[PDB]
Design a protein around this ligand. Structure first.
Ligand SMILES: [Ca+2]
Length: 222
């Protein structure tokens, strides 16, 4: 028929190439299961699968290993796609990671990594990145080849428990240049004993909480 091609899709890039130019919720076939994700279809050519998004404090990111593994939140809003789904997606071919940030004054910034994957659960979903470029600054490279930690699974390189103080699940080092799964505060400045906000060291700094943050992936076709 004369209607556009339809899903479910291998990824947002496949939907984009089929002529779906509007961002929104798409169905992806990830492994043996179809999962709904937000696709950013306009920025930098589109085709970006959102795997993490912060924007309004509606979802608790201080949550269980099982929730970090399986995914939590909902794709129309704040969510975390899940370590296992992201492992499945990035276990097939090369991927670019795009990090999108916005501060409370409306300034935006972007980080790109040419290469992004996770080890499986048996290797604690260790992060692998590729070459960096972007205006945001490279505040994820310090987390390369770090295991994923949550408060009951302290795998970081800190004397104490990074997740306990910075409140995310993350590939904590000692402790972080970026904390995108941290506490979303209702303004850029907040009162806390710890740098626990949604921060990016090289874009507004570790004492700031960003208004919007998101992590997106797309197949990398050289
Ligand atoms: Ca520790």
């Amino acid at each position: 028929s004369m209607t556009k091609p339809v899903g479910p899709w291998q990824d947002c890039a496949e939907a984009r190439q089929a002529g779906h130019e509007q961002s929104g919720v798409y169905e992806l076939r990830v492994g043996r299961h179809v999962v709904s994700v937000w696709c950013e279809q306009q920025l930098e050519g589109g085709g970006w699968t959102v795997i993490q998004r912060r924007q309004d404090g509606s979802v608790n990111f201080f949550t269980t290993w099982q929730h970090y593994k399986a995914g939590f939140g909902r794709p129309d809003g704040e969510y975390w796609l899940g370590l296992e789904p992201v492992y499945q997606l990035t276990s097939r071919g090369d991927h670019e990671l795009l990090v999108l940030l916005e501060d409370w004054g409306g300034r935006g910034a972007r980080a790109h990594y040419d290469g992004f994957s996770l080890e499986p659960e048996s290797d604690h979903y260790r992060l692998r990145l590729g070459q960096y470029h972007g205006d945001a600054g490279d505040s994820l490279s310090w987390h390369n080849d770090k295991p994923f930690s949550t408060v009951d699974r302290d795998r970081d390189s800190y004397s104490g428990n990074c997740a306990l103080y910075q409140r995310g699940g993350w590939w904590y080092h000692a402790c972080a240049h970026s904390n995108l799964n941290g506490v979303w505060h209702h303004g850029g400045h907040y009162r806390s004993r710890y740098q626990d906000g949604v921060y990016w060291a090289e874009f507004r700094g570790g004492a700031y909480s960003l208004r919007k943050a998101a992590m997106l992936i797309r197949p990398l076709k050289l």
